């Protein structure tokens, strides 16, 4: 059904998913000159020491690395959040060229890609129930710019040939998502939505100010993935990002400046 092409891309999603035209859609442009420093926001607590990665999956829209979320292992807390949010997966959005690919923008700047670490609020007991609640999910967004390689990303890049096409998975154990973080945990935060269907308004977004650097070779390997399944016409998995949506009444808060 939905995807990222001319015929099924972001401009069409509202017909199956009317909340696409809602009041709290994501991503947004982060206007750094209107974001409000909030001295009461806490440092983020990213606690990934016990993370247990299990698998990597090409889901036809992105690839995702999934974790064991059946115990409090890898959790996000603090910052703007009230409870504890458990990591379930991360995935990326990227472009066909280094000058596009991120979902969020910063003063209209697009990055080459964006990493989303998806966490669910443990007060809701499971990820699927959390997806139905206004404060169900917290997604940590990290921009990727092209420059030096990110060594912590290479284990991911090297397995992508084994999941070229939609529906392929591979075991992916012992991956440490701490290797994908920038030095600083300074962030912006605002209330929003999933950026892909069903576009539910269930996300507290936490977008880090500092991008990570990845090499041109690393991002090129993302662009060799396919949206299609095996045996179908080849369609390169590129430009799997939703453009910025109207901010509406919302305020973006900053943890710094
Ligand atoms: C069953 C889980 O379903 C979904 C659907 C859409 C979706 N979008 C995001 S994002 N790009 O991080 O805002 S995470 C997510 C999970
Ligand atoms: Zn995403």
Swiss-Prot record:
<dbReference type="GO" id="GO:0038166">
    <property type="term" value="P:angiotensin-activated signaling pathway"/>
</dbReference>
<feature type="binding site">
    <location>
        <position position="116"/>
    </location>
    <ligand>
        <name>Zn(2+)</name>
    </ligand>
</feature>
<comment type="function">
    <text>Catalyzes the reversible hydration of carbon dioxide. Can also hydrate cyanamide to urea. Stimulates the chloride-bicarbonate exchange activity of SLC26A6. Essential for bone resorption and osteoclast differentiation. Involved in the regulation of fluid secretion into the anterior chamber of the eye. Contributes to intracellular pH regulation in the duodenal upper villous epithelium during proton-coupled peptide absorption.</text>
</comment>
<feature type="active site" description="Proton donor/acceptor">
    <location>
        <position position="61"/>
    </location>
</feature>
<dbReference type="GO" id="GO:0070062">
    <property type="term" value="C:extracellular exosome"/>
</dbReference>
<dbReference type="GO" id="GO:0032849">
    <property type="term" value="P:positive regulation of cellular pH reduction"/>
</dbReference>
<keyword id="KW-0597">Phosphoprotein</keyword>
<dbReference type="GO" id="GO:0002009">
    <property type="term" value="P:morphogenesis of an epithelium"/>
</dbReference>
<dbReference type="InterPro" id="IPR036398">
    <property type="entry name" value="CA_dom_sf"/>
</dbReference>
<feature type="binding site">
    <location>
        <begin position="195"/>
        <end position="196"/>
    </location>
    <ligand>
        <name>substrate</name>
    </ligand>
</feature>
<keyword id="KW-0456">Lyase</keyword>
<dbReference type="InterPro" id="IPR023561">
    <property type="entry name" value="Carbonic_anhydrase_a-class"/>
</dbReference>
<dbReference type="GO" id="GO:0070050">
    <property type="term" value="P:neuron cellular homeostasis"/>
</dbReference>
<dbReference type="GO" id="GO:0043209">
    <property type="term" value="C:myelin sheath"/>
</dbReference>
<dbReference type="GO" id="GO:0004089">
    <property type="term" value="F:carbonate dehydratase activity"/>
</dbReference>
<keyword id="KW-0479">Metal-binding</keyword>
<dbReference type="InterPro" id="IPR001148">
    <property type="entry name" value="CA_dom"/>
</dbReference>
<feature type="binding site">
    <location>
        <position position="93"/>
    </location>
    <ligand>
        <name>Zn(2+)</name>
    </ligand>
</feature>
<dbReference type="GO" id="GO:0005829">
    <property type="term" value="C:cytosol"/>
</dbReference>
<feature type="modified residue" description="Phosphoserine">
    <location>
        <position position="169"/>
    </location>
</feature>
<dbReference type="GO" id="GO:2001150">
    <property type="term" value="P:positive regulation of dipeptide transmembrane transport"/>
</dbReference>
<dbReference type="GO" id="GO:0008270">
    <property type="term" value="F:zinc ion binding"/>
</dbReference>
<feature type="domain" description="Alpha-carbonic anhydrase">
    <location>
        <begin position="1"/>
        <end position="256"/>
    </location>
</feature>
<dbReference type="GO" id="GO:0015670">
    <property type="term" value="P:carbon dioxide transport"/>
</dbReference>
<feature type="site" description="Fine-tunes the proton-transfer properties of H-64; involved in the binding of some activators, including histamine and L-histidine">
    <location>
        <position position="64"/>
    </location>
</feature>
<dbReference type="GO" id="GO:0005737">
    <property type="term" value="C:cytoplasm"/>
</dbReference>
<keyword id="KW-0963">Cytoplasm</keyword>
<dbReference type="Pfam" id="PF00194">
    <property type="entry name" value="Carb_anhydrase"/>
</dbReference>
<keyword id="KW-0472">Membrane</keyword>
<protein>
    <recommendedName>
        <fullName>Carbonic anhydrase 2</fullName>
        <ecNumber>4.2.1.1</ecNumber>
        <ecNumber>4.2.1.69</ecNumber>
    </recommendedName>
</protein>
<keyword id="KW-0862">Zinc</keyword>
<feature type="site" description="Fine-tunes the proton-transfer properties of H-64">
    <location>
        <position position="4"/>
    </location>
</feature>
<keyword id="KW-1003">Cell membrane</keyword>
<dbReference type="InterPro" id="IPR018338">
    <property type="entry name" value="Carbonic_anhydrase_a-class_CS"/>
</dbReference>
<comment type="similarity">
    <text>Belongs to the alpha-carbonic anhydrase family.</text>
</comment>
<keyword id="KW-0007">Acetylation</keyword>
<feature type="binding site">
    <location>
        <position position="91"/>
    </location>
    <ligand>
        <name>Zn(2+)</name>
    </ligand>
</feature>
<dbReference type="GO" id="GO:0046903">
    <property type="term" value="P:secretion"/>
</dbReference>
<feature type="modified residue" description="Phosphoserine">
    <location>
        <position position="162"/>
    </location>
</feature>
<comment type="subunit">
    <text>Interacts with SLC4A4. Interaction with SLC4A7 regulates SLC4A7 transporter activity. Interacts with SLC26A6 isoform 4 (via C-terminus cytoplasmic domain).</text>
</comment>
<dbReference type="GO" id="GO:0032230">
    <property type="term" value="P:positive regulation of synaptic transmission, GABAergic"/>
</dbReference>
<dbReference type="GO" id="GO:0005886">
    <property type="term" value="C:plasma membrane"/>
</dbReference>
